[PDB]
C-alpha cells in the first residue's frame, strides 16, 4: 500500500520529485489523506537552474508531485 | 495519515510564510486564518516575480490546494 | 461581493472582474470580467474555476 | 451559484479557457460535480500557433480550465 | 449536475478515442472499460507526439481525470 | 502486478519499475525503478502519485 509505505517513512528523510523541475528533501512529519506533506529541515532543489534552498518547514502539496522516494 | 497538513498551518497562523507557485511566483504574507480546505486568507502579502517585487496586497485569498508550498518563515 | 476583484490563475494568467456569486469549492461568478493579456480582453459574464483559481484580492 | 450558471447553459453554445494556450467552443450537453464537461460540435483552437480543429463530441477534463463563458 | 461524462465514456466503449495531454501528447486507442472515477484501460493504442507517431500500446491504463479531454473519434 | 511497467506523467516525466502496489486513488508502489531523462537514473524503491499518473503499461 502506497500510503502505509509513506507512513512507515515518518521522522526520516524523503526525496520528493515534481511534475516541475524541482525536488526536495527533508524529514517527514507527517501528510493527509491526498498526501499533502509536512516536511522538516528541508533543501529545495531546481534540477534546471541549479539553485538549492533550505526551510524549517513547509506543507508541500500533493497534487503536482510525482514520485516519493524513501532515503535521499 | 493524519491532519498534519492543517495543524502545519494553524501553528504558523498570525506569522509571515512564504507561498509558491510552480509558476515561480513567491508571496510572503501573513496568515491571518484559514478553513479546512486550506484556502487562506492573508494580510501585508507582497508578490515576487524573478525576484522583483511585483505588488502588494493588504488583503488576499488564497487556494492553498493550488499552491506548489507554504514554507515557515 | 459586488466589489472588483482581481484573480490569478495557477497558468499565469490575470483577471479582473465583479464577484457576484460562489460556492465551497472555490468556483466563481464574475460579471464584467478584464483579462491583462499590455493589452485586454472583455470576457464578459464568466464562471472561475476553484480548480486553478490561485489568488483573489480587491482591486490595485 | 456557479453550477446553477453553467446548468443554464446546457444546450446552448459555451466557450471555454484553459491554463494552458487552448480554447474551446462547443455546445454544453452536460456536466459532473466537478465540472468536467461533455461538449458536441466542437472548435478547438490553440492561441499561439493559431490551429484550430473541429470534434463531434468530447469529455473536457475540468481541472486545467480556467473559465467557462457562456456564449461563444 | 448529472453524469453526463461517464455516460459519454460508455457511449464510447469499444469505439476509438483520441486523448490529448495538456502537454499536447495524443493518444488514439480503442477504449475497453472504465470504472466510476474515468479510468480508462485502452487496446491498439498509438502516441503522437508532433504528429509523428512515437509509440503503439497493445494494452494501457490511462488516468482519464489527468487527460485534457477524450473525444470521439 | 510484479511485472515490468512503464508509467508517464503530466509533466512529460517517464519511468519504467515493477509493480509491487497500488490504491484506489492510482497511487502506486513500484519497486527498481529507473526514469528516463537519452540519459537514465535509477530510484529504487518509490511510491507513485495519481494524481500526476497519466499512463501505465506493459513494458515495451
Known amino acids: 500500500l502506497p500510503l502505509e509505505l509513506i507512513d512507515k517513512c515518518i521522522g526520516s528523510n524523503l526525496w520528493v520529485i515534481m511534475k516541475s523541475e524541482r525536488e526536495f528533501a527533508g524529514t517527514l512529519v507527517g501528510f493527509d489523506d491526498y498526501v499533502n506533506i509536512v516536511l522538516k529541515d528541508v533543501t529545495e532543489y531546481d534540477t534546471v537552474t541549479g539553485v538549492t534552498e533550505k526551510h524549517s518547514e513547509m506543507l508541500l502539496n500533493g497534487n503536482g508531485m510525482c514520485m516519493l522516494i524513501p532515503g535521499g | 495519515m493524519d491532519s498534519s497538513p492543517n495543524e502545519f498551518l494553524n501553528k504558523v497562523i498570525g506569522k509571515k510564510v512564504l507561498i509558491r507557485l510552480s509558476s515561480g511566483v513567491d508571496y510572503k504574507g501573513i496568515l491571518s486564518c484559514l478553513d479546512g480546505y486550506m484556502n487562506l486568507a492573508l494580510e501585508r502579502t507582497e508578490e515576487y516575480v524573478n525576484g522583483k517585487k511585483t505588488n502588494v496586497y493588504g488583503d488576499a485569498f488564497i487556494r492553498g490546494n493550488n499552491v506548489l508550498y507554504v514554507s515557515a518563515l | ?60
Chains 1, 4 share one sequence.
Not at chain 3, 466589489?3 to 464577484?19: E, V, Y
Not at chain 3, 464574475?30 to 474555476?49: F, H, P, S, T, Y
Request: aromatic share 4%; charged share 20%.
Open chain 3, 1 to 60: 461581493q459586488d466589489q472588483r476583484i482581481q484573480a490569478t490563475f495557477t497558468g499565469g494568467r490575470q483577471i479582473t472582474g465583479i464577484l457576484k456569486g460562489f460556492d465551497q469549492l472555490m468556483n466563481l461568478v464574475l460579471d464584467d470580467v478584464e483579462e491583462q493579456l499590455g493589452a485586454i480582453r472583455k470576457l464578459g459574464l464568466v464562471v472561475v474555476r476553484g480548480t486553478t483559481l490561485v489568488l483573489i484580492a480587491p482591486m490595485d
